[PDB]
């Protein structure tokens, strides 16, 4: 079933990656980072891959009107009616499933995808993609006719079943956070917040290790320690824009929807 098709996405979480231009020509970390655009369909159905997942709610449950994304260390929700894809003009969304978006868009030089935040903010990224689809045949028409010939011409199907092609996933790394540090006169205090943390401090001796409770370290300045979350039980997509953990071993594989058909 459709709900049964979402079993795989139970052990995955979204991520935040560096994308060069995120709306106003300023580099900014975003949860809607674009990775690849595939255009193997002859009719011109674009296939877009981005960090946020469609169809999954924060509590890891199937739902078709929510988009979940990473923000900080947690996962929030956004309405699906606030998804826009544009290439020199608004374009139409034919079907969305997990990491991937299917759209058909007018000719243009750049591609942009945007979603709305919990605080009604707008998060977007733009990349460069020379899009110009030549229709199949020997005539460069634009709109279907009401009297014509039938010719073979391939496209993406909206079926969500398992396909041969797949992508790979791997364990997320330790993510530094500087906000779990506080100064108390001549001491530094770390706040667990419910997540295991790892530290390394050069003040004193024997101040390395991993703990999961609030502690204080004396005779240390705030700049003399570094902490990072470690638990990371979920999975992440193997992205060139995020560092890889210690283990060089592939951990899991996830199928990708929307295969090719005549």
């Amino acid at each position: 079933s459709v709900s049964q098709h979402f079993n795989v996405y139970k052990a995955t979480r979204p991520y935040i990656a560096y994308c060069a231009d995120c709306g106003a020509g300023h580099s900014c970390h975003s949860p809607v980072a674009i990775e690849a655009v595939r255009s193997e369909a002859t009719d011109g159905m674009l296939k877009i891959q981005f960090s946020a997942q469609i169809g999954i709610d924060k509590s890891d449950n199937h739902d078709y009107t929510k988009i979940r994304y990473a923000d900080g260390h947690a996962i929030e929700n956004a309405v699906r009616s606030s998804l826009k894809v544009a290439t020199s003009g608004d374009c139409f969304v034919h079907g969305t499933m997990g990491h991937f978006i299917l759209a058909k868009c007018p000719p243009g030089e750049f591609l942009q995808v945007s979603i709305q935040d919990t605080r009604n903010a707008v998060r977007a990224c733009r990349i460069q993609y020379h899009h110009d689809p030549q229709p199949v045949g020997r005539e460069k028409f634009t709109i279907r006719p009401h009297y014509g010939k039938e010719i073979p011409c391939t496209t993406y199907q909206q079926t969500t079943a398992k396909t041969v092609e797949e992508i790979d996933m791997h364990m997320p790394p330790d993510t530094p956070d500087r906000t779990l540090l506080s100064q108390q006169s001549g001491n530094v205090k770390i706040t667990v917040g419910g997540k295991k943390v790892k530290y390394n401090c050069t003040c004193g001796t024997g101040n390395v290790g991993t703990t999961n409770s609030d502690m204080t370290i004396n005779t240390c300045l705030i700049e003399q320690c570094h902490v990072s979350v470690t638990d990371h039980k979920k999975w992440q997509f193997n992205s060139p824009f995020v560092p890889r953990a210690d283990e060089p071993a592939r951990k899991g594989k996830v199928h990708i929807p929307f295969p090719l058909d005549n």
Binding site: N238, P240, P243, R244
Partner: protein, 49 residues
């Protein structure tokens, strides 16, 4: 058509690494020294250079 597969970069702090050749089409690996990676939370590791 071809697709170039490029995995996530391996960064090691306060240390060094070397990579070995593999039987794979057009394998190209290199080791770059003296880097200071940055993430959204802050710096990634202690050692400066």
């Amino acid at each position: 058509e071809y697709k170039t597969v490029v995995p996530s970069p391996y960064v090691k702090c306060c240390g060094a690494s070397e990579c070995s050749t593999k039987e794979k089409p057009d394998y190209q690996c290199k080791v770059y020294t003296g880097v200071y990676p940055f993430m959204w939370g802050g710096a990634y590791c202690f050692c400066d250079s």
